[PDB]
Design a protein around this ligand. Structure first.
Ligand code: LI
Lengths: 202, 243
C-alpha cells in the first residue's frame, strides 16, 4: 500500500447507522476497483467491484467511484455487528499488479438494550487455585484498557451474540497468578463504570 | 468438484537462515496468481505476481523472496535464507485473467524463530460460570484460557455435546503477550461461551474448548527434557451442574 491507501481505523459505527469506508489511489494505469471483506483469521472475499464513475448498489452495500478525484468508497447501510471486519480496497494496475490498501477495520457497536455492568469471578472446572475475572454486560462505549502490570492480563472487549435469545453482550476477561491478586486490581476504576455489580465469589 | 486454490503448508516454524518454499496450486485454469504478506500495521503487501504462465514480476516487497511460474497450476514462493522480518501471514490468490476477481487461499502462518526451544504448546483450562452471574442474569458464561504458547499459531473452538458452536461465542482476535518486555514472550488467548442458566444447569450438557496448536513438524530435531512441541490439540472441558 503506497499506490493504494486507506485509513487503518478502527472505525466505530453504531448499529443501524451508515458505515463509510474510503480509499484513494495513484491515477497512472488504474483500471478496476474492488472492495474485499476479511473477517478475523479468515481470507479476503470480494464484496464489490466497480470500474466506471458513479454509484453501484448491491443490497446494503453502495460502492462509489470518482476517478477524477481518485477515490473509491463503500457505504454500508443499516450496519450490523456481524459487518465487523477488515475492509480492503484493491486496485488493478496496467502491467499485472493487484495492489491492496492497508485495510480499514470496521467495528459495528451493538446498542446494549439493558446495560448491567458486572464483574464476576469464575473458578476452574479442574481442581486448582485458578480463577478468572469476567467484566460483562457493559455498554458499547466502554473502553477496556490494557493492564499496567506485567503479571495481570486483561483482554480487549468482544461482542458475543446469543442468536436464539436475540441477545448481544460485551465482555472482557482478566486473570493473574499473583499471590495477592483481586479481580478489582484488573477491573479497577480506570475501566469499570459507576455502579458496576461486583459480587464477592462464594 | 474443483479443489480451488490451496496453499501448503498451512503453518510453518522456520529456524533463521533456512530455505523455505511455500506452495500454492489451483485447479481453476486461472492465469494470474499473486503472493501477499499480511502484517498488522501494513495490510496486504504484494510480494510478487504472475499475470500468466512464464511471466512473473516484483510487487511492493520483493526483497528476500523469489517466485517462478513454469506452469498455470502452480506459483511457488521461495525464501532463500529466512530472517525474522519474514514472520507473517502469507496469502496466495488467483484470478481467471489479469483484472478479474481474485480468489484467496486459506493463508500460511510462517514464524521465523532464532531459537527453536522458545516453542511451547498451550495449556488449556475452562472456567465455570459464576453463581452470581446465574443468579443476576439467568445466563451462564464459560471462559476458556489458552496460555503459555509460542509462537501464536492457534485456533480455538468450542464444542457442546460433540458439536461445534458459534452462537454465544466470542474469542479474542489477537493473543496477548504474557511477558511484553520480552520479544520472544509466550502468549495467551481467551474465549467466552455464554448459554442460558438452564442449559448450564443440565448435567447432561458437555462443554469443551479445543485449541489446535501448530508447532514443529515430525521432521524437526528435539533435544530438550520436555516433549517435542508438535502440532497438536490441547483441550479442557466441563459438565453442566445443577447446584
Ligand atoms: Li456509558
Amino acid at each position: 500500500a503506497k499506490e493504494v491507501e486507506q485509513n487503518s481505523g478502527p472505525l466505530s459505527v453504531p448499529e443501524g447507522a451508515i458505515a463509510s469506508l474510503n480509499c484513494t489511489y495513484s491515477d497512472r494505469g488504474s483500471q478496476s476497483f474492488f472492495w474485499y471483506r476479511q473477517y478475523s483469521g479468515k481470507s479476503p472475499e470480494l464484496i464489490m467491484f466497480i470500474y466506471s464513475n458513479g454509484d453501484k448498489e448491491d443490497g446494503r452495500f453502495t460502492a462509489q467511484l470518482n476517478k477524477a478525484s481518485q477515490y473509491v468508497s463503500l457505504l454500508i447501510r443499516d450496519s450490523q455487528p456481524s459487518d465487523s471486519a477488515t475492509y480492503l480496497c484493491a486496485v488493478n494496475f496496467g502491467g499485472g499488479k493487484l495492489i491492496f490498501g492497508q485495510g480499514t477495520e470496521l467495528s459495528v457497536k451493538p446498542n446494549i438494550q439493558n446495560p448491567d455492568p458486572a464483574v464476576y469471578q469464575l473458578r476452574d472446572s479442574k481442581s486448582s487455585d485458578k480463577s478468572v475475572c469476567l467484566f460483562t454486560d457493559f455498554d458499547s462505549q466502554t473502553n477496556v484498557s490494557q493492564s499496567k502490570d506485567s503479571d495481570v492480563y486483561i483482554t480487549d472487549k468482544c461482542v458475543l451474540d446469543m442468536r436464539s435469545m436475540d441477545f448481544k453482550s460485551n465482555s472482557a476477561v482478566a486473570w493473574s497468578n499473583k499471590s495477592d491478586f483481586a479481580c478489582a486490581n484488573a477491573f479497577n476504576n480506570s475501566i469499570i463504570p459507576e455502579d458496576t455489580f461486583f459480587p464477592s465469589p462464594e | 468438484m474443483i479443489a480451488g486454490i490451496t496453499q501448503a503448508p498451512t503453518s510453518q516454524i522456520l529456524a533463521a537462515g533456512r530455505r523455505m518454499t511455500l506452495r500454492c496450486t489451483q485447479d481453476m485454469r486461472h492465469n494470474a496468481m499473486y503472493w501477499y504478506r499480511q502484517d498488522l500495521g501494513l495490510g496486504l503487501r504484494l510480494i510478487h505476481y504472475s499475470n500468466t504462465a512464464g511471466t512473473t514480476g516484483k510487487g511492493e516487497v520483493p526483497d528476500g523472496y523469489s517466485v517462478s511460474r513454469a506452469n498455470t497450476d502452480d506459483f511457488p514462493l521461495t525464501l532463500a535464507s529466512a530472517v525474522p522480518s519474514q514472520t507473517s501471514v502469507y496469502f496466495c490468490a488467483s484470478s481467471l485473467s489479469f483484472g478479474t476477481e481474485a480468489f484467496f487461499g486459506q493463508g500460511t502462518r510462517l514464524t521465523v524463530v532464532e531459537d527453536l526451544n522458545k516453542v511451547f504448546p498451550p495449556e488449556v483450562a475452562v472456567f465455570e460460570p459464576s453463581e452470581a452471574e446465574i443468579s443476576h442474569t439467568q445466563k451462564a458464561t464459560l471462559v476458556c484460557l489458552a496460555t503459555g504458547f509460542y509462537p501464536d499459531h492457534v485456533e480455538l473452538s468450542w464444542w457442546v455435546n460433540g458439536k461445534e458452536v458459534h452462537s454465544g461465542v466470542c474469542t479474542d482476535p489477537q493473543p496477548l503477550k504474557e511477558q511484553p518486555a520480552l520479544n520472544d514472550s509466550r502468549y495467551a488467548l481467551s474465549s467466552r461461551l455464554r448459554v442460558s442458566a438452564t442449559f448450564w444447569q443440565d448435567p447432561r450438557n458437555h462443554f469443551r474448548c479445543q485449541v489446535q496448536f501448530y508447532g514443529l513438524s515430525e521432521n524437526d530435531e528435539w533435544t530438550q527434557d520436555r516433549a517435542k512441541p508438535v502440532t497438536q490439540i490441547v483441550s479442557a472441558e466441563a459438565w453442566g451442574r445443577a447446584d
